[model samples]
Target: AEKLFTPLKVGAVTAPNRVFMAPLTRLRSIEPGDIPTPLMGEYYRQRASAGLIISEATQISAQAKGYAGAPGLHSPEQIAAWKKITAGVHAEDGRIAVQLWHTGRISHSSIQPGGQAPVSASALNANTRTSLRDENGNAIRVDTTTPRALELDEIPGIVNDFRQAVANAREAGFDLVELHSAHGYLLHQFLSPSSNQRTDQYGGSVENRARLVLEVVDAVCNEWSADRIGIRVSPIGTFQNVDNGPNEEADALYLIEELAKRGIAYLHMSETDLAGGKPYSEAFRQKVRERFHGVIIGAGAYTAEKAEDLIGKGLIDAVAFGRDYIANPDLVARLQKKAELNPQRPESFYGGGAEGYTDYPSL
Candidate 1:
């Protein structure tokens, strides 16, 4: 517990502990405009005990949304609501970073603005399921449809969206901003050949496939200091039908080197452990550590003891908790006390008011 409780400097913010909160999708934002509610503020404030709270995946624009009730950061109303939410986290002396995302092909047209087809690296079906709320606000799983390929001229709009999202994040009082470049989202689709089959500059080789992500990073850097930004990547796992492809390791290393050059705050790797796969190979973990000289966060079904061992080995600087954080707002304290925790109610994981959200007990 000594190592887990140690202060770690992650860019401008000093995380007081190694137990950070991973972003979990809690579709509780108010509809009609996808505005965050007071309940949402209360929910996050309750969990401010985390060393740092990487916010739930938030869309950067109307067209970037995939699920109903997921909050956004584009509109004035959304920014104002987030301003309030960030203030609540700060009131408790907690640091928060908004995880900005673009869902790409993992979306249904019915939920899109103007019912437009979702965009992706290629014009293909995700062959995955996403969420939408029924008339009674019950979460329903729906198949994703084939998406149209984005035009070459339109790529800058995507980059600009990220830049604007960062600028908005600053206005919203977030301590940091995490780019959602993982989980088969738009950015991940562009990085993997399994999803991106384009022969253009954005695809075909490691450097080419990494073009969009790098450009997005450059754009974000132009708007904000790289030290204030972090990114999340799932470099080894298949998610939403998109895998890192045959050159997964090389692609990840190349991107990591590029990110290191920009001096970003941290690199968050969502390890592939829960799905019966090893957490991360020692060779690969060493490779990442060698290339990126920044705070590295490992997430995915990690216990306090395992996290401590990894941190002891210098394999990871910090650990992020997903499900455990969902049920235990005082997770950091629970780990310190070695106390029992509340079990998560998965039925209320997605859409709902506060039943399983802020109502979780703290030790």
Candidate 2:
């Protein structure tokens, strides 16, 4: 209990505690441009008590968009808009990292530029659905469209997009940058053999499948150092139709070792169970600890006591609280005092204004 509230040094930045806020997409960005709104700034400001906060998954390019009303880091307007939110978080002495994302095949043509087919590592369908507005501005759920395989020559462009997004994050005054390599996004699509069936250098073996992700990291290193970068991964994740072949665990271990060699800041592991029944096994976490020497953040449906237990056992360095932060802005203080937490309104979790967002009161 005492250790969870103690200050910890994570790479270049020293967080005030080990309880961090995981990225949650609220889809409250202004329409048309999908820019960050002032309401979003206020929302994050309420949760500034967190030791660290990972911003919602933000599109790195116009083509990277999958869901409607999510924020982006591509345009000058978007960058300036994000400045307000970032400034708000920093004004309260909070540290934040921008999660750069690309949806890959987890999108509909309605969300893509010029109504073109979404690009992916292979011409495969995620068999998932996403929500977006039609021409009439009515929201509807539609199955994701089949995506076309990206050409070898065009892969560099994808890496370049990440590099530019890092620069944009720097301009917005973020403490660091996180690449969304998990949750069946574009980078995960390339790493998962189920989705990447091409015979090119970017597919087949585990090493080949991981090429594109490393390339993106290399590109980002040009703008930010290894100490200022973090990555999220879902090793046993089947969410968004991500199957890492028969060697799911091995592939993740390989990727973690490679990331460790690069000396990245941290490794954030998303929950494996969508039902919140099973978190990552202790053996798996031990393997990660042996491979990576940097900070490790474990996120799922974790309570303060559970997180403290895991940290006490040396399994994880920190715990990222998700929905709890939505209903408890003063989560750290509440945990310290053993106070009650407000329940989050599921109805207002996705698309809405300020009802269930910044309105959650503190103890």
Candidate 3:
């Protein structure tokens, strides 16, 4: 019989159980500075009932931030603030990881470093509305311009940014770190030909397109142990209209194969709309299973029964609960005890006070 709660070691870090918390976008960081707030610490602490808690995607540097109210790890003050959050989680016996983020063309001049235009793999602009706060701090949607393509010299510096952020994350007390390669972010922009229309070494064929993603992961792994690093990949799901829809599966498989060899702790795999929408084909899931020997954590609309079934048959090593974790702070305990889950408040889901952030009841 397979066990879902059994302890597993991924590289040097050991997770107490198989159920891990998925990284969800929660826009609660202070604007401009993008510092991690005390509310964030309370948010994760209340939900530390999981085997591992992956904090919301945080920026690696000022230039990497695309969304307002997301946390960052580049500054000493930011690192010091997060250190407090990590300590609180550790005090509760909760292991947490920080996912370093870069918004790429999903950002605006107002949000970029020095109010400059956002940069991407190519000079193509993101064809979506940018989520930002107005002068009065009200949420507004603005049109994004075509971003400037990164120079050849800029590639190495970008890669180094990830490595430096990992070092900062360690100082901030994160046991593991994940690269935000999904959501049509910076790393994802480098992976898509539609977005990366470069004729240079980092473009054209799949191998060429995958260079940045590979290099960034490699750099991040160097700072944090391979087992302490994870990656998030979203195929066909366009967050900012910059998706790899044309060659979704090919890109996904290629990236997965490349990442599998690194001996990372786990592959945080998510689909466009699989389960409660469309269940993943068994063959494809099996292929991922065979390709990656390390633990595979599957997300996306998975019910308790469905997750248990996948885990029971060894299709995946663990499940990353997202929306459910938002409403139910004690989600893992409820699942383990077969208890009812609390419902999340849709109205107060975004930038707000403790209403939907940390004031949820646990059933």
Query: Highest lDDT among the candidates is held by which one?
Result: 1
Model 2, stretches more than 4 Å misplaced? 134-139
The local lDDT score (0 to 100) that residue 300 gets in candidate 3 is 83
Stretches > 4 Å off in candidate 1: none
lDDT-best of 1 and 3:
1
- Rank candidates, TM-score, best first: 1, 2, 3
RMSD of 2: 1.4
How much lDDT does each candidate structure score? 0.91, 0.88, 0.82
Residue pairs clashing, model 1: none
> Which lDDT tens digits does candidate 2 get at residues 1-363?
467898878889999999899999887777788899999999889888899999999999999999887899999999999998899999999999999999999988877999999999999988988877666544467899999999999999999999999999989988889899998889999998889998999999999999999988878876788888899888775866786678888898999999898888899988754475455778988998899999999888787888888899888889898888888999999988989889879888777688888899988
User: What pairs collide in candidate 2?
Assistant: none
Scored by Cα lDDT, where does model 2 land? 0.88
Better structure of 1 and 3 per TM-score: 1
Candidate 1 local Cα displacement, residue 159, angstroms: 0.1
Regarding TM-score, does 1 or 2 come out ahead?
1
Task: Tell me the tens digit of each residue's lDDT in model 1 across 321-340.
Answer: 99999899999999998899
- Per-model root-mean-square deviation over C-alphas: 1.0, 1.4, 2.0
Candidate 2 similarity to native, TM-score: 0.97
| Residue ranges of candidate 3 with Cα displaced over 4 Å | 236-239, 273-278
Pick out the ten consecutive residues of candidate 3 with the lowest summed lDDT.
271-280
